[PDB]
Design an enzyme around this catalytic site. Structure first.
Site, short mmCIF file in Angstrom:
data_model
loop_
_atom_site.label_atom_id
_atom_site.label_comp_id
_atom_site.label_asym_id
_atom_site.label_seq_id
_atom_site.Cartn_x
_atom_site.Cartn_y
_atom_site.Cartn_z
N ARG A 11 0.38 -7.42 -0.08
CA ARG A 11 1.08 -6.46 -0.99
C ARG A 11 2.65 -6.64 -0.66
O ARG A 11 3.34 -5.68 -1.02
CB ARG A 11 0.29 -5.17 -0.98
N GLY A 53 -10.29 6.78 9.07
CA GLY A 53 -11.25 7.00 9.90
C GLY A 53 -11.23 8.18 10.65
O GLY A 53 -10.30 8.77 11.15
#
Lengths: 445, 445, 299, 150
Positions: A15, A137
């Protein structure tokens, strides 16, 4: 004690849309990964292990740094797998800290807390509670006790409320670490580094956690928009440090330091100044709007007027340069010298209180004190390159071409529009004088 | 009525790391303390008493202002002690307002509310409630009634919740004020100005309070980072006032006014423009990116192209100047005149519709209408300085040196590369013409 | 399907202090009203009807655009009156969307949602809930059902709590629209366009509502300070689009694009660069601080 | 505004009409017979707007207890008011010096004149007018109606 670091930098920066390995992309003009190395060096890191997948060759190229221990990798198949590849490289008596090449802003304090909150035979883990944790997470605690990490993926609606998340940065003894590693599975298809948390509470060890003081310390770069945000954060920080240390910035949000700035007292820097390489500024220096300084020494009390560019240049005290002046490597101004608008200086010295005010080019020149370089004077010094020399108290008329090698002795004077090929003697006048010729009543086209 | 002010400005600006007295440090190019004086003047302040410790001499120096009443001070030993030193200077029939030299942004409205909420024989006190009051003086009220100020120091956990704090700005009658003052102790070792609040509720007087409309009005400067924040606030304010009054700023956050800008209608100012001194712009003027204007008049419909610097310069209507142009004091453009790139103008007038397009220096010159100044033309006017004069319809070839004093009459034409020492007659052509000399098959080094 | 637009642009931009018609004032170097036209073009707008009061001549001048259908107006006497003047111009089989020349940032997505949430024989209405709604038109719902708009003016203390407000942008069939229009009064002295909401729940039709994704999409320009805020918003947007598409900007808040930038890969642009017209940059180009490029190809 | 015709915005208006109000007899005669029947009935509500109509000011005070304006439509409602009323009476007797061993199991249906240091145990009911002298003790379950106790 003993301590080493590992920098993970193996993924595909897709990206970034770049032919350059993500981690080599610069922040304040230096590779993201060098910020991380720099920090590791500041820890006392005895060795630095760098794990990379593709981009290998020009990675180790664009990073000379012969001090580093490189670690190849099949082809990005597990962040834990990566950590396995360097595992046989950890001495059992040393701590091993884990960092990422695309998280350039991680401060030493935050790491030199992580290394203190590490429980003997255990993990020191960096964490941050998020405003919106909607994809990271989760840190899963029981009685506030770290037991393991949950991927946003497999996270119950109840877990998804866990603000606190994994930065991915952590510590552990090299021995213990070698252990916990190669006891993990691949049943995404990959191996998660996450697991060694539960696989540590497994054999009854305690995993502590410290937080970074700024969110930006753990910001990762996946694209250029993200990198630009970190650039701004980094520049605001530098700017504020200079303000607090006594430098006046007329607008710290239009200031950029890409290197190092040594400074004395009572310096003013106006808007839109960029500082590259290593710049030394003395007391009471003024830098006007738009100036770019790269690897320069500027003496006490000098004034750099707006839109002046300097590189590898030196000014003694009380000099003035600009506006619209261009000093190139080797450019040197003696005390109280002046360089004006549309003037370029290359490998040349302009002596005490000498002036070059307008529309001139001076290269490969040794010019003395009290010299007046008229408007439009050119050292015609290219045919390698040859030396022009001018003594004290010389007057050089406007639009003179000095054809080097040529020497103009002290007190000499040179008429306007003169070509100088031969040497000039003390107090001698020279006028390249022709005869202007006259037509009466001339009809202009 | 009658009213005087006192400006406290005696502390050590240690954290400024400066050889210049803190209050002299500029905000929008003018001493912090002058903003405060300015405001006092706008109140109708009959007298202004300035209390200073060290920095005395160059304080009263760098501040000419022969209108001021200076007040020496032993050596900063009490903010109240300071207020004692000027106490014998307050007429009993006049109000006395107290301000600080390092709080430059205090608005008149906020003071001209303070002076209205003053209870006869009492104090008008400026206050602000803080997000985080974690170190200031608390305003201690009983039934919402001001009774006295508590230093963060000696403040119970219960008091520390008092959001509202002391700005240190307040009013009182000169008579009453003389009273409350020299009735205070020194048992930090110093005398607190805080006390005269309780020492006023003491003898049964009412102490009222107004708030400033902006937090920045009561922001104090202890260092340069703080000053830079106030600079930005001040500049945003100015910029918004110009936008609301009809000036288009292409980016008001990259605009700086350090002085005064008089303007007409439909003006456009592009990014990174700085305005110094007093600048007058007519209708429909366009200023491109990067321009610096200092003490200039620009006539209706003129266009200033990017990266052009002007100081003490005048343009009539329809002129065009830049890019990369440098106009110095005395530079004057008549209607529809044009100055191009890499051109410098000093004490020179370029008449109606005259052009100086490239790489020229014009100083001490009177140039007429319809004149063409070729590329590379130089007034060689330095040997004091001498005058060059050029009439209408003159054509000056490129790279001509005009050696002043010299006069070129109307309709004259000057060939390229000509040195002009003698006068030129109407419609006369002059060509400084030599003979180019030819070597065949020449081997270039 | 079939669809036309009407751009309202007739008021006096008094607070612009300008000799130039408000809507012609540029945003990123192009007339506010052209942004709106541009968007209309992107909808497939078959025709664009532009309603103006004063400034007429140099409006149609400074806007060549021979494709446009101009609509004169007595002298600003009713925003609804204005909508009447173009009413005889709406084909009964086409949808008619209403936009304002001084709201340049309205995105296509937000309009191409409005045109989907339009109830057959009814109005699609754009709305926004405000932090502080302290002076606008309230959206008055009953069971969450749009029934009519209340001007901040005549608004009970209870109504003034209605966060959600009228952007003034809406849709409707050309036939139905011709209807609802010339059935309104003048008893401010003017005719309110507001009314056709209740005058639609009147004859038992449903008025739906979508919201814009950004507040700036419905920001109106009355003065230059407002316009400058929109300029910054527009520039931040462009800058972020170039960053995400692979261009490195050393400071995206000191970057300005006034036109189009075609680019290849791994380009670096330093601070304070301005890009005007159409600029084409190849791979690996570096642009230093302060450069201005207008209509250039760089290899 | 009747809850009936009330916009979602109005329905947030906490403050409501008790239906109790004042007005001069003259002015009142006025505002009344100037109202319509176009529920089919005539609402007393209207004389509020029909008073701001001819430019008069309508002030408002609040009751100190919600129970002051509780209306009875059924017996459950009435029983709640009974309990409120009895708690009130009981507390007034406690504050005036009568000891009630359980004021929630006490009922006064009439008037109780009392002297000093009286004790009343649980589940006593007092009806009519009862006069109790100093230092009287009434045990559990007693019912006294129109009695003088020395």
């Amino acid at each position: 004690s003993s301590m080493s670091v590992v920098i993970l930098a193996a993924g595909k920066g897709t990206r970034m849309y770049s032919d350059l390995p993500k981690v080599l992309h610069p922040l304040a003009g230096k590779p993201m990964v060098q910020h991380v190395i720099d920090a590791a060096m500041k820890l006392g890191a005895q060795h630095v292990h760098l794990v990379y997948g593709h981009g290998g060759e020009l990675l180790k190229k664009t990073l000379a740094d012969p001090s580093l221990n490189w670690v190849l990798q099949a082809e990005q198949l597990g962040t834990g797998h990566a950590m396995q590849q360097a595992a046989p490289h950890f001495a059992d008596d040393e701590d091993i800290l884990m960092l990422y090449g695309d998280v350039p802003l991680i401060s030493v304090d935050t790491l030199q807390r992580l290394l203190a909150a590490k429980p003997e035979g255990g993990i020191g883990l960096l964490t941050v509670k998020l405003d919106n944790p909607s994809g990271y997470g989760r840190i899963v605690r029981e009685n506030g006790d770290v037991v393991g990490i949950v991927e946003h993926k497999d996270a119950s609606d109840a877990q998804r409320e866990i603000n606190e998340i994994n930065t991915g940065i952590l510590v552990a003894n090299g021995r213990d670490l070698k252990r916990w590693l190669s006891l993990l599975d691949n049943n995404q298809g990959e191996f998660y580094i996450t697991d060694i948390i539960a696989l540590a509470h497994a054999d009854g060890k305690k995993i502590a956690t410290v937080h970074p003081t700024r969110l930006s310390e753990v910001e990762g770069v996946n694209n250029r928009l993200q990198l630009s945000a970190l650039e701004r954060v980094f520049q605001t920080e530098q700017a504020e440090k200079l303000l607090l240390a006594g430098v006046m910035l007329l607008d710290p949000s239009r200031f950029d330091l890409r290197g190092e700035l040594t400074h004395g007292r009572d310096i003013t820097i106006d808007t839109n100044v960029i500082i590259e390489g290593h710049v030394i500024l003395g007391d009471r220096v003024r830098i006007g709007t738009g100036c770019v300084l790269k690897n320069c020494v500027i003496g006490d009390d000098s004034e750099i007027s707006p839109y002046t560019v300097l590189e590898d240049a030196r000014l003694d005290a009380n000099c003035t340069v600009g506006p619209f002046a261009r000093l190139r490597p080797g450019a040197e101004l003696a005390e109280g010298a002046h360089v004006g608008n549309f003037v370029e200086i290359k490998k040349a010295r302009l002596g005490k209180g000498s002036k070059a005010g307008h529309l001139s080019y001076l290269g490969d020149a040794e010019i003395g004190a009290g010299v007046n370089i008229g408007a439009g004077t050119i050292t015609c010094n290219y045919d390698n390159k040859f030396k022009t020399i001018i003594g004290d108290d010389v007057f050089v008329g406007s639009d003179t071409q000095l054809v080097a090698p040529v020497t103009v002795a002290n007190g000499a004077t040179i008429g306007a529009g003169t070509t100088v090929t031969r040497d000039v003697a003390e107090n001698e006048l020279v006028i390249s004088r022709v005869k202007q010729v006259h037509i009466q009543g001339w009809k202009r086209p």
